[PDB]
Subunit: 334 residues, 3 copies
Amino acid sequence: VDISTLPRVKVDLVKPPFVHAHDQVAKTGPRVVEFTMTIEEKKLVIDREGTEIHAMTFNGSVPGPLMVVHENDYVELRLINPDTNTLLHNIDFHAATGALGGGALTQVNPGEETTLRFKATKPGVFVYHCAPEGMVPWHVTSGMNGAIMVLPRDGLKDEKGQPLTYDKIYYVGEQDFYVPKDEAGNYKKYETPGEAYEDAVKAMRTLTPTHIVFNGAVGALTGDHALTAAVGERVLVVHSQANRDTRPHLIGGHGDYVWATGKFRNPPDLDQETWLIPGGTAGAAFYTFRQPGVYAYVNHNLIEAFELGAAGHFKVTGEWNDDLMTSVVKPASM
Amino acid sequence: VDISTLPRVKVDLVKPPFVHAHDQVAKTGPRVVEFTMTIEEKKLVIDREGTEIHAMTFNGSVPGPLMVVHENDYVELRLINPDTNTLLHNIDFHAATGALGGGALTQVNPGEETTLRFKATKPGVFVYHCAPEGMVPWHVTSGMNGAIMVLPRDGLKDEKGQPLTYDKIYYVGEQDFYVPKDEAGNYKKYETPGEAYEDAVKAMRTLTPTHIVFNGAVGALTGDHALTAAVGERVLVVHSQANRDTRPHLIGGHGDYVWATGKFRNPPDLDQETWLIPGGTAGAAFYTFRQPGVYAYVNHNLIEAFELGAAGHFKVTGEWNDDLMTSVVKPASM
Amino acid sequence: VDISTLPRVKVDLVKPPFVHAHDQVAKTGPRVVEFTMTIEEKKLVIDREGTEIHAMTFNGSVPGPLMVVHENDYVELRLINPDTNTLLHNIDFHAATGALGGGALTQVNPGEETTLRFKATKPGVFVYHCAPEGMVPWHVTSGMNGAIMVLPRDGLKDEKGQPLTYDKIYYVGEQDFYVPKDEAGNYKKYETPGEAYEDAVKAMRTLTPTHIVFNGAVGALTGDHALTAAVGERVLVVHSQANRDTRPHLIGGHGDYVWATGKFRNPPDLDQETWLIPGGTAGAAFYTFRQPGVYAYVNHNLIEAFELGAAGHFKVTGEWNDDLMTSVVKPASM
Ligand SMILES: O=N[O-]
Ligand SMILES: O=N[O-]
Ligand SMILES: O=N[O-]
Ligand SMILES: [Cu+2]
Ligand SMILES: [Cu+2]
Ligand SMILES: [Cu+2]
Ligand SMILES: [Cu+2]
Ligand SMILES: [Cu+2]
Ligand SMILES: [Cu+2]
């Protein structure tokens, strides 16, 4: 049918790791879902040492916000590049078909805006990212990426096709940064992005990230900003990596149902300890918490997690179950 | 039955990314399929800068040609090492059972030939590569690898077991090269392969390729050599990496049906954005084009794609579908 | 029911690649299975050059021993840290639920012991490793890891749900070591673990292992210590990597049935040439040998296998099958 006859809904995006309100099961027919994002180039402190980079962001955050729609909705994105920015940007949705995922049609100079519409024909979680010709990896590895979830119209289903319903959803975007180092191993500093570019390229070509972080910085998902849940709650964690493979693991838990490559027409993998999300992919894992306390959620290359930054915490409330685990003899001398 | 009573068919191989003519559904009983390959050691220019390596090839190309047979055919390979070559070579088929995939039985010095036969008992796409004792990774990372497709006798089937038929097939071999660098970062030059060997080994041990290319060189699958299709065509892309993990992605499309690890008795993964092909594996992805224009097919570590070379193009002809994607407001000022 | 009313069985662990005796199909009701492990910090020679590291081990071996239980058994582990050790240790089971896999409850100083019990609620093969707060990757990458197999109570089943029974089982633990190098590229030497720590951290942060080995050393699974089988035997190989992705391959064979991410409620992948086990995961592959002779089992990044050490051998006895493979014309001149 004619697109103009469809309902329109405007969505206001929220900062990761939170996700905008939506229904898992579609309560309306197919809609045009309107999103707006404003590009912001900004300084960001990415580690405990105070290393500061020039980040390139969708809507002021690394990662960009999680958009949520249903299969066969239309996504209409208004992308704004304000005059206070210096670079050309665009957007490629892996969820979309044609024109380099939209990138060929969304090139915006500072001071310009554009509106793209596409039909979300395939259910799953998908990466989106900036991809300006000749400079793709630089923009992506400076923070300019996020994800979109296209839910099946009747929600998520298990390996047997029975309903799976989540109580909470979180979005973890994992970012590999490549801060240029001198011969001594110190991080170089640059006046302008153009003076940064070649050294940025040389650093990228090492294929060795200097930092690998969740939600834009070392420790971003810890402390007061730890993820939360209660014993018995069903949590969906959507995890994306636009450029580099990752291997999420919940320390003390499991992925009860996992779409490691993120596409909901496939049956989920059951009972995973660790799962592989290839670079350029988003995945989703569903877990029901069974024990309280602190959990760490990590990239299980443990160097990547505990030295380069790819670690966050869940604080879980509720009853301790001694049947599942107990200290029989607490640590003591002999 | 006695092998001598079977039909024999001789196949003449073609240069990747093209594939020799074959039937998807087997029109004959089990056959002996005869292939011939001639080893050629040659200089190859691998990048825009004119970096020239001593390549080791099957049949003059990187990758070697795609062989296609059906499940329970016999593959009879005549491998020729002419006297103009300097090194010992052999061949290991991952499709074969026994004798290190044939490698124990096919060692040929310059001036020698050998004929191996094996039964293709398992359907799938499989790597083949050179593997001379004591020097395996050097030969493999100098170009000496390809793939073989063993089709099910009744062709490919979807996740529900209905027929899937491809209209075109392409073979992308992805090659990681490790050109030795000095302390300054320049590529070293060597008189003979023996003088090259240790520096080749040290470069390999960095685990950081200097180049990652499709069809033997940066830009080999672009421009006049872009892959082609039309809107509505069903295309199979077979992709191999003998040594290093890769993560293919069609920018602007999907893998509608994907055998990421390449073995056809398993149901395909549906609707993939990006898929992981482990080093030492061949995979296959089937896509029906729905939009015209240029597509890029990339390793979605984007540094690997756009800086080290792992990117090619499809040029697709046909009708633009405004329902699937459209520019609502073209990029403009405010 | 009350745990005290269950049967108890004490198991005596064996050195990898061998596995303690067990039944595939559970011959008793749910039990408490008692294991004891003693931490041993020791010097280990890891390569042909005689490079010696200070290893941190469970029970004196790298990897630690494979524990085998059935789904819904209880695992009771007595962990002993003798006074001859210098460091704090603990244990995290990926098989367990809660308290960081047990790590929060098992911290033992030299001279102390502890007993943990957990319920093995999920069938599969799982990593266990040391994880002391603030120093996780160092302990894990110094050898302190192993695996546990939780069999389904009715044993393993194929993709159709018919029984699969193994005749032999082997455990290959793959270890990535990061020996610190100076500016010249020589391996540094250290008096105490505390003087080693920062250089250990800097080496880890390169993300480039210096050694990647099976069973604790280059060539540990070769020669007199080669794995063995006979033609016709069904062999299960359990393979773990606590920190880094690997891609096992049996040269001359296949993975007939593969749980690449190791969890037995999922159907196995069939006919794999090579499979990906993500860092932080254990996998399992079942193969029936069809040809005699020497096989190599390798990480199929071939640099990792043949230069850094991730290669072992099987010696297989029995009848040669000329139908599956034969030399038609043995290597000769022209
Ligand atoms: O943008 N990645 O967090
Ligand atoms: O040989 N690989 O393109
Ligand atoms: O501990 N890994 O062999
Ligand atoms: Cu941008
Ligand atoms: Cu992309
Ligand atoms: Cu060769
Ligand atoms: Cu191989
Ligand atoms: Cu320890
Ligand atoms: Cu762990």
